[PDB]
Short mmCIF file of C-alpha atoms in Angstrom, two decimals:
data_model
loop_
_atom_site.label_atom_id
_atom_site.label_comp_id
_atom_site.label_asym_id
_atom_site.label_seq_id
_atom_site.Cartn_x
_atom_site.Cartn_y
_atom_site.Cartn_z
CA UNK A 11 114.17 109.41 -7.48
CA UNK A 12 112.69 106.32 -6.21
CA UNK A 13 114.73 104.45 -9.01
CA UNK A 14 117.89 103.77 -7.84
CA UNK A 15 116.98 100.28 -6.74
CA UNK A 16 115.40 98.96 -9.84
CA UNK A 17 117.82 100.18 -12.72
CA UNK A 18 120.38 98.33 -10.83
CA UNK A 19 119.30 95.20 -10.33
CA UNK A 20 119.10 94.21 -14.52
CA UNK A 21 122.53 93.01 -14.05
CA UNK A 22 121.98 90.34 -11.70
CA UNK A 23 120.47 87.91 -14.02
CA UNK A 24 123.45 87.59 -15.84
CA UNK A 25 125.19 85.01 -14.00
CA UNK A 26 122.51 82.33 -13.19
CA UNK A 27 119.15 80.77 -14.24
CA UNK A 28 117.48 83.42 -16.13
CA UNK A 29 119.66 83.14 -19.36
CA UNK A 30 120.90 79.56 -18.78
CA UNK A 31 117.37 77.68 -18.11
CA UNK A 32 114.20 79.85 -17.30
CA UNK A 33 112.06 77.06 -16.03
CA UNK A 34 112.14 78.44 -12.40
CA UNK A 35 110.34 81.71 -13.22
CA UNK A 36 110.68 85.01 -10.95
CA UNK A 37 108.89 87.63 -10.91
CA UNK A 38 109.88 91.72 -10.52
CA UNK A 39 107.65 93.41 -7.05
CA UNK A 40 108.23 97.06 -7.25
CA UNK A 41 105.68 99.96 -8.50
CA UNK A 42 107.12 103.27 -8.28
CA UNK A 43 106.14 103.82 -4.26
CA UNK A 44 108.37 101.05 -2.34
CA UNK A 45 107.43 100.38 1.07
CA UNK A 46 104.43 98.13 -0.63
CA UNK A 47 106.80 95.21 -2.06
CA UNK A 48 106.87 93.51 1.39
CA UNK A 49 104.62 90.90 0.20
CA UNK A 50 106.98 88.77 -2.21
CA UNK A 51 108.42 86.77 0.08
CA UNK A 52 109.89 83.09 -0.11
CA UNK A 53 107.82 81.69 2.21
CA UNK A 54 108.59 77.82 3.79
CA UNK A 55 111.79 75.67 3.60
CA UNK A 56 112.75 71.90 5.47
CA UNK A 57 111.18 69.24 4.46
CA UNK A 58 113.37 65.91 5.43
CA UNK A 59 116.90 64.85 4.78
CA UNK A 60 116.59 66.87 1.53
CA UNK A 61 120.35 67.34 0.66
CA UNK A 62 121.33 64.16 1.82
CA UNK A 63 124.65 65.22 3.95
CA UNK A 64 126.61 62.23 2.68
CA UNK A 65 126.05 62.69 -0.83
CA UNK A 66 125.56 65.86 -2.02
CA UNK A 67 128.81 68.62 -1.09
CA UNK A 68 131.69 66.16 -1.83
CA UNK A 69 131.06 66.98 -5.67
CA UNK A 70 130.74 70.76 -5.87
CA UNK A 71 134.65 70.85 -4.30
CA UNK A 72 135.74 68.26 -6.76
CA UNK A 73 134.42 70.98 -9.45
CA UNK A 74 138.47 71.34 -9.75
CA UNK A 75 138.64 67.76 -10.81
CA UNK A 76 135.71 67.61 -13.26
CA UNK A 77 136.78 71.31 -15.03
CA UNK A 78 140.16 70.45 -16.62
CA UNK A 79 141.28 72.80 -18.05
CA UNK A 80 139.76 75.60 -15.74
CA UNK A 81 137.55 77.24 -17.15
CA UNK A 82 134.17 76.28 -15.21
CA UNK A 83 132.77 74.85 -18.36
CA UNK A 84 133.01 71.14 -18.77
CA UNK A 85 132.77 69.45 -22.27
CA UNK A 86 132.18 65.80 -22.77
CA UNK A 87 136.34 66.06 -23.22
CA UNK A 88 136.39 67.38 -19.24
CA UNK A 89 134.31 64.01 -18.03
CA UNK A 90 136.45 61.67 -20.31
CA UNK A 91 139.66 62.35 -19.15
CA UNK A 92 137.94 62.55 -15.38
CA UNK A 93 136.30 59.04 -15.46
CA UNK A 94 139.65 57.88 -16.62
CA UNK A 95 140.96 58.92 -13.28
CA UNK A 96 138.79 57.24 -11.33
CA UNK A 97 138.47 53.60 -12.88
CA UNK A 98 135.55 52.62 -15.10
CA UNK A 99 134.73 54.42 -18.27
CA UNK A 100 131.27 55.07 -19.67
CA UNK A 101 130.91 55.51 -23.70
CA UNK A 102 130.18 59.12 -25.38
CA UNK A 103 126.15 57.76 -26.02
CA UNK A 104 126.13 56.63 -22.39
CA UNK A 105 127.46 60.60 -21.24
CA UNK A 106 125.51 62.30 -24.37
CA UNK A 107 122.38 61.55 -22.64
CA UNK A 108 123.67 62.56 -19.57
CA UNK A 109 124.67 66.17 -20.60
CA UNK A 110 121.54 66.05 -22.79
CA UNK A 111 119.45 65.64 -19.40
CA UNK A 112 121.12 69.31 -18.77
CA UNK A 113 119.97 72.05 -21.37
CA UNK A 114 123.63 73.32 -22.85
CA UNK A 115 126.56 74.72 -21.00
CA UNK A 116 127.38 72.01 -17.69
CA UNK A 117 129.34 74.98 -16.31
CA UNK A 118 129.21 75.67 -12.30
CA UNK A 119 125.85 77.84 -12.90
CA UNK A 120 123.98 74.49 -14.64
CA UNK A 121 125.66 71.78 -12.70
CA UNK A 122 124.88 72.54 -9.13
CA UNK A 123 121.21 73.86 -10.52
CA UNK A 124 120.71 70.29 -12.03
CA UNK A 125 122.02 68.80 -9.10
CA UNK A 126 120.12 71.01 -6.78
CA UNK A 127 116.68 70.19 -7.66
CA UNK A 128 117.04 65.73 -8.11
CA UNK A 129 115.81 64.44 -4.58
CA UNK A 130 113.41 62.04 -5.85
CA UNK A 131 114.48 58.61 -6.16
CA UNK A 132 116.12 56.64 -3.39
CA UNK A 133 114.39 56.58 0.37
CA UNK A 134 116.06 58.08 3.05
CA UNK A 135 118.74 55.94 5.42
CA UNK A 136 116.00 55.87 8.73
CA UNK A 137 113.07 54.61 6.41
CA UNK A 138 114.53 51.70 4.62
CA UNK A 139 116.74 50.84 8.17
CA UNK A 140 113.30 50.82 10.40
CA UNK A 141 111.66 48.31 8.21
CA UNK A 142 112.65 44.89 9.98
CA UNK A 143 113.40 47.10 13.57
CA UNK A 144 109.46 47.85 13.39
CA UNK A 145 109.00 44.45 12.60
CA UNK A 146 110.86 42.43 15.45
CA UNK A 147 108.10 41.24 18.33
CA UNK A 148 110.36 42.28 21.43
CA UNK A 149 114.15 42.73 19.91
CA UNK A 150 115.83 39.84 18.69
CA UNK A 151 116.61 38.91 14.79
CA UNK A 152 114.34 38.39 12.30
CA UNK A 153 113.63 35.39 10.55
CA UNK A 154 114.79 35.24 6.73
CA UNK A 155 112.04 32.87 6.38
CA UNK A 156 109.34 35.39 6.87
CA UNK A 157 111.02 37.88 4.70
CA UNK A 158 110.96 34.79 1.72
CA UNK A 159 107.63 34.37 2.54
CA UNK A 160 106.76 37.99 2.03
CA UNK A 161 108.77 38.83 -0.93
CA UNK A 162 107.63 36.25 -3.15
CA UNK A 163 103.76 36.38 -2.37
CA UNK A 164 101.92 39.31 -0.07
CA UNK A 165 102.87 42.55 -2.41
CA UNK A 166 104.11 43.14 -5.76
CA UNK A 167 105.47 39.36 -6.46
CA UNK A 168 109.50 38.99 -7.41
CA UNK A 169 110.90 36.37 -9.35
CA UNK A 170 112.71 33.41 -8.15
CA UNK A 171 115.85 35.13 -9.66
CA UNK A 172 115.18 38.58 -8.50
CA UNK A 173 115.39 37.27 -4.81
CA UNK A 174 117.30 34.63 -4.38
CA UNK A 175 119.92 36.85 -6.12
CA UNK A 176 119.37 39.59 -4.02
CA UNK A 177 118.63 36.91 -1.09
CA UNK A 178 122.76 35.44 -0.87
CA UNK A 179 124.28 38.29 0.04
CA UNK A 180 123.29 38.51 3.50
CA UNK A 181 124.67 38.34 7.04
CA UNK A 182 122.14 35.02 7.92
CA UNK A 183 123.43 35.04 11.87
CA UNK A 184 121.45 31.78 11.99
CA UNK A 185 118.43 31.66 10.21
CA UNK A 186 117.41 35.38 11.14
CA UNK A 187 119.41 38.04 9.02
CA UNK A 188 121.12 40.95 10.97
CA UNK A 189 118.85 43.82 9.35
CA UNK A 190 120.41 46.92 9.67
CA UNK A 191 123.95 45.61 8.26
CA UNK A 192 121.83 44.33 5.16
CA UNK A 193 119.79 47.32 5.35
CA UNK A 194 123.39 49.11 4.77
CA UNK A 195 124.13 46.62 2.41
CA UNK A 196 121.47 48.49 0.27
CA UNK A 197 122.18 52.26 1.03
CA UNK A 198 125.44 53.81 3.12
CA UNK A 199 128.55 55.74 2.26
CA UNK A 200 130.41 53.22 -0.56
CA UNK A 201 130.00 52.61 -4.13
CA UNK A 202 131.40 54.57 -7.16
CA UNK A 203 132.25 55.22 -10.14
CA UNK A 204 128.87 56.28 -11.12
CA UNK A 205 128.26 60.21 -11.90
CA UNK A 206 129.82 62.79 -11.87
CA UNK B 26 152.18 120.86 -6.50
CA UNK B 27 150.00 117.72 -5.18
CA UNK B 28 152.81 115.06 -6.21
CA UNK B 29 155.56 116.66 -3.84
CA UNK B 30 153.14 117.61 -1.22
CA UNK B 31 152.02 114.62 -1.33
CA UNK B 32 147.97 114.36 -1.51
CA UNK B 33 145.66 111.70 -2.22
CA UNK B 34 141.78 112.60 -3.22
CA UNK B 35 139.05 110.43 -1.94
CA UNK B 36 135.56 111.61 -2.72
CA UNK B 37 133.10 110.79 0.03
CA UNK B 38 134.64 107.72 1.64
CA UNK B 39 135.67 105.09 3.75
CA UNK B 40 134.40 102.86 5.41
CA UNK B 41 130.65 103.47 6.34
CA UNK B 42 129.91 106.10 3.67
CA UNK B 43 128.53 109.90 3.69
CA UNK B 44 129.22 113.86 2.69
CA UNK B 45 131.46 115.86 1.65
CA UNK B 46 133.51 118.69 0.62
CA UNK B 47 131.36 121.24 1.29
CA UNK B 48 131.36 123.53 -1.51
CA UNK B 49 131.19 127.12 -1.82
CA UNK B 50 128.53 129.40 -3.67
CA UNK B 51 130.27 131.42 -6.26
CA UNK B 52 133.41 132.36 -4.73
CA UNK B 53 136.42 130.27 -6.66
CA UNK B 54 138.83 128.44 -4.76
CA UNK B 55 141.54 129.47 -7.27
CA UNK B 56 141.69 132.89 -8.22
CA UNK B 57 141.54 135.10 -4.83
CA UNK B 58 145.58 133.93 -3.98
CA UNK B 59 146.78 135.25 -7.23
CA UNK B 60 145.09 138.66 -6.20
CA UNK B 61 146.91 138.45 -2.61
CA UNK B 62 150.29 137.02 -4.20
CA UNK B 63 150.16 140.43 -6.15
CA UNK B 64 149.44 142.24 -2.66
CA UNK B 65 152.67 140.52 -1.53
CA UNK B 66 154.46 141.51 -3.78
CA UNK B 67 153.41 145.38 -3.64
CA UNK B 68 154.34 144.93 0.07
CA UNK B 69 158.01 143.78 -0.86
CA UNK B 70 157.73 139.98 -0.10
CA UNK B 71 160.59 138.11 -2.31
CA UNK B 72 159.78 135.06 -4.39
CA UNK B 73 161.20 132.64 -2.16
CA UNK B 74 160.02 134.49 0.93
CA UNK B 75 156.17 134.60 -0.62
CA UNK B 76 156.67 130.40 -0.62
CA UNK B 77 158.10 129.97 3.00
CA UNK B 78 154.86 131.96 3.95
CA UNK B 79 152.56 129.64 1.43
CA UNK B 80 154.94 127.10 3.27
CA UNK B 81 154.06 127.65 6.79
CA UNK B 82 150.33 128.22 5.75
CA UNK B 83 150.05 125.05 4.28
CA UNK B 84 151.97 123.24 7.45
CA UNK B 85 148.62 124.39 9.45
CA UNK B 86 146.12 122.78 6.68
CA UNK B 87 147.80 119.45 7.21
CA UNK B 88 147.97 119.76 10.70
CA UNK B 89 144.06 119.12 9.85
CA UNK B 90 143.23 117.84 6.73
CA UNK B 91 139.82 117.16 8.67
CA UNK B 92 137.86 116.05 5.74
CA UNK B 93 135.16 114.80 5.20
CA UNK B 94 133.75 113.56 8.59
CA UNK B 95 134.88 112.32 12.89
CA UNK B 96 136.26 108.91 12.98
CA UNK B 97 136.54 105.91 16.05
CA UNK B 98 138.67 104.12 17.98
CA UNK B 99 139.37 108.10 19.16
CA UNK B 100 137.67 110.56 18.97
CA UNK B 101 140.01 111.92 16.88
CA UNK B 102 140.36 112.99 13.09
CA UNK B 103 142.76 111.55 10.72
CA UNK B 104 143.10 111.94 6.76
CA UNK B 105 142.53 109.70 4.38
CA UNK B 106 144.51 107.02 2.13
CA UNK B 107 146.99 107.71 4.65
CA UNK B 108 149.66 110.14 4.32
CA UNK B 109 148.29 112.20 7.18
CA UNK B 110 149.54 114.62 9.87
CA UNK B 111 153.75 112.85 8.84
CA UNK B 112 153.36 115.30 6.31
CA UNK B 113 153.34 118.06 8.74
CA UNK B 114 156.19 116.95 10.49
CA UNK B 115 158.67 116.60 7.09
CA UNK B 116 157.09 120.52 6.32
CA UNK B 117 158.69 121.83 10.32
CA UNK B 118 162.06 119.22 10.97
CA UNK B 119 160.76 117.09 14.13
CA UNK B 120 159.64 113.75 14.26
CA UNK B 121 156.37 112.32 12.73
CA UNK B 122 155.12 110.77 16.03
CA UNK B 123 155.26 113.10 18.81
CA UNK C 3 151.22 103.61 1.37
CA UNK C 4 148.25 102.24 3.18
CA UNK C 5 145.99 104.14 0.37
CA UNK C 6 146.08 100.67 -1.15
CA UNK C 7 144.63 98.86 1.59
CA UNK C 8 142.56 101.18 2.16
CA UNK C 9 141.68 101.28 -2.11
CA UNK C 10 140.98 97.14 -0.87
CA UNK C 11 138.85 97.98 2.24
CA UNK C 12 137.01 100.95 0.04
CA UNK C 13 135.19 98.10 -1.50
CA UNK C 14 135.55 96.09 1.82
CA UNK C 15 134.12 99.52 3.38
CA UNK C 16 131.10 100.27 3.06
CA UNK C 17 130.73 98.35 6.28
CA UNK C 18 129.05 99.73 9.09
CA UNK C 19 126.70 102.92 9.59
CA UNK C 20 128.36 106.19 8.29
CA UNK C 21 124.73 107.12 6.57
CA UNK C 22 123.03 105.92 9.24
CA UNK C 23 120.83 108.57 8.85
CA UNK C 24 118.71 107.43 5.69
CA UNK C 25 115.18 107.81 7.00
CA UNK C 26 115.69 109.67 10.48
CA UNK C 27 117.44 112.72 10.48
CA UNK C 28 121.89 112.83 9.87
CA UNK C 29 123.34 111.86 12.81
CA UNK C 30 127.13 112.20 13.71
CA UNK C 31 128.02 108.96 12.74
CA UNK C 32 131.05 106.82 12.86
CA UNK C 33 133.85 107.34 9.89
CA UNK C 34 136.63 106.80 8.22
CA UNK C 35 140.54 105.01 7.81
CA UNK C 36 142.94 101.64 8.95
CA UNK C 37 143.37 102.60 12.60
CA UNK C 38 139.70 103.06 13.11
CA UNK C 39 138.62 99.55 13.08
CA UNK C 40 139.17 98.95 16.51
CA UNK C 41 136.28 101.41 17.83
CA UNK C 42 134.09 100.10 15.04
CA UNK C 43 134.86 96.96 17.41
CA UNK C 44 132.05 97.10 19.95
CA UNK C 45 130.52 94.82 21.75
CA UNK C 46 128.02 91.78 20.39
CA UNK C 47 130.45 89.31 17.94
CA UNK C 48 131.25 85.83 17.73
CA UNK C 49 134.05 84.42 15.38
CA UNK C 50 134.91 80.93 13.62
CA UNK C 51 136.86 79.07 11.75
CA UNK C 52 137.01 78.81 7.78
CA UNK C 53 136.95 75.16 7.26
CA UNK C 54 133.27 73.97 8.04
CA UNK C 55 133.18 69.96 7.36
CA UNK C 56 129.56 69.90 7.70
CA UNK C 57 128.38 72.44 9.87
CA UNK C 58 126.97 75.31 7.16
CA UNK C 59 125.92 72.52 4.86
CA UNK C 60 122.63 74.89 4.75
CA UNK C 61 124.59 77.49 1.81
CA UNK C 62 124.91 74.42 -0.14
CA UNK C 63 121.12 72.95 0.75
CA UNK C 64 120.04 76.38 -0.13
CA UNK C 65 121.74 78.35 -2.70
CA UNK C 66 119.02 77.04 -5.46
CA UNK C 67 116.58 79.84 -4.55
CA UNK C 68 118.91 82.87 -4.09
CA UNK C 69 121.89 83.60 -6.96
CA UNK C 70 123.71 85.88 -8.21
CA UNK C 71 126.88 85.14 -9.54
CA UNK C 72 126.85 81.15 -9.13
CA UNK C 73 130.73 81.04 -9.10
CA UNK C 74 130.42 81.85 -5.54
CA UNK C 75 129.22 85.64 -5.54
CA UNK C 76 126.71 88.32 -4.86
CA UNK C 77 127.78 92.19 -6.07
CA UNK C 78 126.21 95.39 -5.34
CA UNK C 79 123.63 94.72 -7.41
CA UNK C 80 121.50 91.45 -5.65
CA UNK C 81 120.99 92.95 -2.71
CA UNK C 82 118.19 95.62 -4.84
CA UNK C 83 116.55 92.41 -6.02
CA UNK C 84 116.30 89.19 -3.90
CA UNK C 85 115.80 91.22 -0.53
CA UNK C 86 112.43 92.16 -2.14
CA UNK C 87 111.16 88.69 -1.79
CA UNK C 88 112.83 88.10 1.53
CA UNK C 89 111.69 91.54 3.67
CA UNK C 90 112.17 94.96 4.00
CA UNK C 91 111.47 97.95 2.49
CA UNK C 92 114.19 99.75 0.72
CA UNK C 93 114.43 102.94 -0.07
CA UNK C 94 116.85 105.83 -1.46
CA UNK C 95 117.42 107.56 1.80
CA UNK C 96 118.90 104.19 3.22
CA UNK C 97 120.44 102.53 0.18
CA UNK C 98 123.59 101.86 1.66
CA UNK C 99 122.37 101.63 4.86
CA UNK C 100 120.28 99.19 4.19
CA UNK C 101 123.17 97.38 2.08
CA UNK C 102 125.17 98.29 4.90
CA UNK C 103 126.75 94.90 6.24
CA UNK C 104 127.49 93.54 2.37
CA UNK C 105 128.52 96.46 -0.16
CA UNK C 106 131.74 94.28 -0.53
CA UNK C 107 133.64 91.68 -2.63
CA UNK C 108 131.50 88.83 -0.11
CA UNK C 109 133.92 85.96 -1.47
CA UNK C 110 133.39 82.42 0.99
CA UNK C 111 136.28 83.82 3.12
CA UNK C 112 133.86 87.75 3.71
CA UNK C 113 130.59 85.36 3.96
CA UNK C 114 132.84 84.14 6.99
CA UNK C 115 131.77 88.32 7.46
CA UNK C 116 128.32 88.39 6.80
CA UNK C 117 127.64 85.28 9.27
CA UNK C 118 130.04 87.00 12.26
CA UNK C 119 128.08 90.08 11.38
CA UNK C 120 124.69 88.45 12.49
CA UNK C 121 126.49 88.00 15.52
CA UNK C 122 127.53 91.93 15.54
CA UNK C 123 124.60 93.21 14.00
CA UNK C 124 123.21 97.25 15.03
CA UNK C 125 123.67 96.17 18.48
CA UNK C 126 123.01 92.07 18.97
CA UNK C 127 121.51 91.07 21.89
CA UNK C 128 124.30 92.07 24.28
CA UNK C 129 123.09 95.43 23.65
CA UNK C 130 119.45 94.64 22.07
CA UNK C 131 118.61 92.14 24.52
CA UNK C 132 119.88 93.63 27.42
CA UNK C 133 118.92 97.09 26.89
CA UNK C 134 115.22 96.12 28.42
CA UNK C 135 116.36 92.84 30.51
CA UNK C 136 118.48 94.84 32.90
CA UNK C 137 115.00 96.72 33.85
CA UNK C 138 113.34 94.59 36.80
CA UNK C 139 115.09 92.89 39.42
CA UNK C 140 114.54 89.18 38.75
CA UNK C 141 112.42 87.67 36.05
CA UNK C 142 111.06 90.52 34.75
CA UNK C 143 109.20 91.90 31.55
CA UNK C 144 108.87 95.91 31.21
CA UNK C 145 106.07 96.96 33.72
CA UNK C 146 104.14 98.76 30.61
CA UNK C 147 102.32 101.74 31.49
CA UNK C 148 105.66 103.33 33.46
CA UNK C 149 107.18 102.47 29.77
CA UNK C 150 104.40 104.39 28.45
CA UNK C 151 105.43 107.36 31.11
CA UNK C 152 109.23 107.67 29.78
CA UNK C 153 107.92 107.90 26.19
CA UNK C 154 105.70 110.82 26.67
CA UNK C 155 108.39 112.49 28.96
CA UNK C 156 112.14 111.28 28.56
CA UNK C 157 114.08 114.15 26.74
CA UNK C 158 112.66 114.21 23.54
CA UNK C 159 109.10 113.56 23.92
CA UNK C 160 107.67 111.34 21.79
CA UNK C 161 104.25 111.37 19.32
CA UNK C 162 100.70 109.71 19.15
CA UNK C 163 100.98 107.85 16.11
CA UNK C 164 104.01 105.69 17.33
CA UNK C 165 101.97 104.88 21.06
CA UNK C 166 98.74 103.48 19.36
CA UNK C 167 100.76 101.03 16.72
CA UNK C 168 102.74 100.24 19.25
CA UNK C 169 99.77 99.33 21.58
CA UNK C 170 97.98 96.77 19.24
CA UNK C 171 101.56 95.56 18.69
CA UNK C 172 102.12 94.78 22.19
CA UNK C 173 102.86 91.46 23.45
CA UNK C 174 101.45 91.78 26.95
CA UNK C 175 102.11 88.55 28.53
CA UNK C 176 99.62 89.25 31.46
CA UNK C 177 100.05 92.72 32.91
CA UNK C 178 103.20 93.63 31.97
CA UNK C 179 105.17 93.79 28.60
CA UNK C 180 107.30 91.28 27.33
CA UNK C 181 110.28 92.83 25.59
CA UNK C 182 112.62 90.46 25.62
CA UNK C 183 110.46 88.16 23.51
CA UNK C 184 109.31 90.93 20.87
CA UNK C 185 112.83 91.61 20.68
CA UNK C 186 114.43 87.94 20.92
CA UNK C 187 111.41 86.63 18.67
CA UNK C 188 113.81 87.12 15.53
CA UNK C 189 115.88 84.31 16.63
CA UNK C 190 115.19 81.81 19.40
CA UNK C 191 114.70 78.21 17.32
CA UNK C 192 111.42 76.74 16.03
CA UNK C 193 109.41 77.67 13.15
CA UNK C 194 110.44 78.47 9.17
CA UNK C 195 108.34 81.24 7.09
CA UNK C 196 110.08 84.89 6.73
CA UNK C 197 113.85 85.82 6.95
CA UNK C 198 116.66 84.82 5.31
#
């Protein structure tokens, strides 16, 4: 009495995290008198667009795709005959890393976990679009001139490849470049086939 | 017996939880018939006869079968995994839903 | 016949308030089999659809902190465990109770019936709201001392203990007591600490 709660709950480990990759450590309230364990809570959530909507669901469905031959637990075997569907093929080294930047078993327990904590990277779609809006005088274009003069000298200094490559493709609407179309040029809803 | 008669057994159940099957202190449910069967029979009560009575007595239990707890959309009581008060009506010779 | 659904909705039922009586007294409570769901049907619901495109993305964003069994499950067994770190007590009077809206096989299709069920609730807002808004006669809050009559007096009169906590407790928006807020305070929109 006053232990029906707490031999039950050893079975919920099983499934999840605390077999498959005990980094993210929890920890067990309950002395024998109950009503004190309401101070464990999981306290603060939101910080921006953290699961990027366009980006991170349309994956988890296509679980089907990736597991073959159904059984939740993809091999290297389950990707290669996947990437094959889709167009362009990456070596066994080039994947080996890959599943060796999961610990084991890429089943639907250490997939989504893996994928769940990777934010950190690319900027979100209103910070890299307001950089030449913030920077227009009144509303009109801005001139690619400015953004040459910039580039090359007042920051971290490219090369004369690395932007003039990076430089041609773009919508010049007469000597100004139409920034958030370019700005899209560098982050919307497009390319594949690149993992997984 | 509980084949033909048809009965289920549920233990506490449906669909919200609770009791019971109240039990009864040291008195056995099986026993005390087999001492009034024997008073039947004293009396003069055939074999056939002493079933048609067992019959009839049973055809009031499942007019019941109020176990184990009062039950919404009612107020009524029904029996459970179905079944039910039919059973009553195959044990008489009218219909099921009157 | 009907045993079987019934055998179905023993697992899926479980739902709704037959031991409602963990910590207070056994009350007659609701009951029992497939007829019966349609008095169970009170008032306070609201119903959807089971395609979601993006609107729950949220289950997705935050599944991470929660598991159980990462296939797409929680069992009677999680509910003993996470809860602890995201509020009440629980206790062995109200186990099942306190369980009460999920003892069942909550696949995406009966998380459709968990969300619904926020919506239904021991008496949502259409009830719980209500209850104390339909008190004044036009933009009222619950004139506080003639609350503090009916709780001393009104059929089953009431103890010190509950007046005192409930006195430091009280919101009193300026000379009167605002229910509907210390009621509708576990919804409204705009914050994010406690509860999950």
């Amino acid at each position: 009495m006053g232990d029906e709660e707490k031999k039950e709950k050893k079975k919920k480990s099983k499934k999840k995290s605390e077999e498959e990759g005990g980094d993210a450590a929890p920890a067990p309230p309950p002395p024998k008198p109950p009503s004190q364990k309401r101070r464990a809570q999981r306290s603060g959530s939101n910080v921006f667009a953290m699961f990027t909507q366009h980006q991170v669901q349309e994956f988890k469905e296509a679980f089907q795709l990736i597991d073959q031959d159904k059984d939740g637990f993809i091999s290297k075997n389950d990707i290669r005959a996947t990437f094959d569907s889709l167009g362009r093929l990456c070596t066994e080294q080039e994947l080996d890393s890959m599943v060796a930047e999961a610990p084991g078993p890429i089943n639907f327990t250490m997939f989504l976990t893996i994928f769940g904590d990777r934010i950190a990277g690319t900027d979100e779609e209103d910070v890299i679009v307001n950089a030449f809006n913030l920077f227009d005088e009144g509303e009109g274009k801005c001139k690619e001139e400015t953004l040459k003069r910039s580039l090359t000298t007042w920051g971290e200094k490219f090369s004369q490849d690395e932007v003039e490559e990076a430089l041609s493709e773009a919508p010049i609407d007469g000597n100004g470049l139409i920034d958030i179309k370019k700005f899209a040029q560098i982050l919307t809803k497009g390319a594949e086939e690149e993992g997984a | 017996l509980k084949a033909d008669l048809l009965l289920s057994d549920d233990i506490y159940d449906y669909h919200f939880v609770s009791q019971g099957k109240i039990e009864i202190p040291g008195v056995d449910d099986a026993e005390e018939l087999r001492l009034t069967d024997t008073a039947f029979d004293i009396l003069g009560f055939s074999h056939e006869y002493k079933t048609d009575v067992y019959k009839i007595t049973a055809s009031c239990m499942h007019l019941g079968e109020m176990k184990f707890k009062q039950r919404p959309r009612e107020e009524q009581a029904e029996a459970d995994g179905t079944e039910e008060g039919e059973r009553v009506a195959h044990l008489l010779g009218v219909n099921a839903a009157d």
